[PDB]
Design a protein around this ligand. Structure first.
Ligand code: 9T9
Ligand code: MG
Ligand code: ZN
Length: 308
């Protein structure tokens, strides 16, 4: 058992990117089995040249993927393996379809994919902070990045695990740089951090001073990209988005029915999502499909919200 799943995975052919649909921003995972997401994930690595460039062994990447999947909680409604998988998927799409691959280094890409996949490891549920309570008090500094420090702890734990060391093909200098960025990438998924840094990102777009050769503006962009992907369900074709909002809602009430939801989706869109997917689109307007999706979802939640 469990060694079960790996034999299946290690053996099977990985369908192409076209065949798995992973290049579409409109991607949906609902039909897929856990087994099929694993394959999608391998394809993500392979088609980003990561298996080649960092000489990853196939058995190892497979065991890492299942270990990552294993370490989410199915009992949690939204913050689970499928959320993480979708975030990686979105990061895939944004690199290929949104043409961001060409604006980044290989280590950068490697670290973002591992980050995205790993960015909510061990999440227990939004209203259900056991990570918070049974911790050292002196969690009052409120680095908020505190859940996110847990996630990175767990990301590093798996990375290091025997069988699972997909970064062992790196040089010690490469490994250090990569991990640095995984850390920043996962901590960037704290929304408090996004709120605190987006002004700078939007100013540079507004004032037209934006420049990725500046190492500081690189890191910034990577935090913003991570957030974009993490939220990206908000951009999905309406009937997917609705279902995802349902899971979000389950978790946000269960540790004035669907009634509350529409107003809250619009709130969240307006407060957070809209401006980000606008900015991303200025940087690369092949990412427009996310903006478009975000807006179309807004029209639809607004219309319903008005007691249709
Ligand atoms: C201690 N922790 C506790 C958890 N967290 C709280 C901060 N607030 C947060 C954190 C979040 F990430 C989201 C978030 O990811 C959102 C999304 C998404 N839609 C699509 C993709 S993501 N929709 C809504 C709106 C909403 C909020 C509550 C609801 C509801 C709808 O329906 C019923 O209840 C979101 O609000 C959020 C509020 C961070 C701090
Ligand atoms: Mg998170
Ligand atoms: Zn997340």
């Amino acid at each position: 058992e469990e060694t079960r799943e790996l034999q299946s995975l290690a053996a099977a052919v990985v369908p192409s990117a076209q065949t798995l649909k992973i290049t579409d921003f409109s991607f949906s995972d609902f039909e897929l089995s856990d087994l099929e997401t694993a394959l999608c994930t391998i394809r993500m690595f392979t088609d980003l040249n990561l298996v080649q460039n960092f000489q990853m062994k196939h058995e190892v990447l497979c065991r890492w993927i299942l270990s990552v999947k294993k370490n989410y909680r199915k009992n949690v409604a939204y913050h689970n393996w499928r959320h993480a998988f979708n975030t990686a998927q979105c990061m895939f799409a944004a690199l290929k379809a949104g043409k961001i691959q060409n604006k980044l280094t290989d280590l950068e890409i490697l670290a973002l994919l591992i980050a995205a996949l790993s960015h909510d490891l061990d999440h227990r549920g939004v209203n259900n902070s056991y990570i918070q309570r049974s911790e050292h008090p002196l969690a009052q500094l409120y680095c908020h990045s505190i859940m996110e420090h847990h996630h990175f702890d767990q990301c590093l734990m798996i990375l290091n695990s025997p069988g699972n060391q997909i970064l062992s093909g790196l040089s010690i200098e490469e490994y250090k740089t990569t991990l640095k960025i995984i850390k920043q990438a996962i901590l960037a998924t704290d929304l408090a951090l996004y709120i605190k840094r987006r002004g700078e990102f939007f100013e540079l777009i507004r004032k037209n001073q934006f420049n990725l050769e500046d190492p500081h503006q690189k890191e910034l962009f990577l935090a913003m990209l991570m957030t974009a992907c993490d939220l990206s369900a908000i951009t999905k074709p309406w009937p997917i988005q609705q279902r995802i909002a349902e899971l979000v809602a389950t978790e946000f009430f269960d540790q004035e029915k669907k009634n509350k939801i529409p107003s809250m989706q619009v709130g969240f869109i307006d407060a957070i999502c809209l401006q980000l997917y606008e900015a991303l689109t200025h940087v690369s307007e092949d990412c427009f499909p996310l903006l478009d999706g975000c807006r179309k979802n807004r029209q639809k939640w607004q219309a319903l919200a008005e007691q249709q």
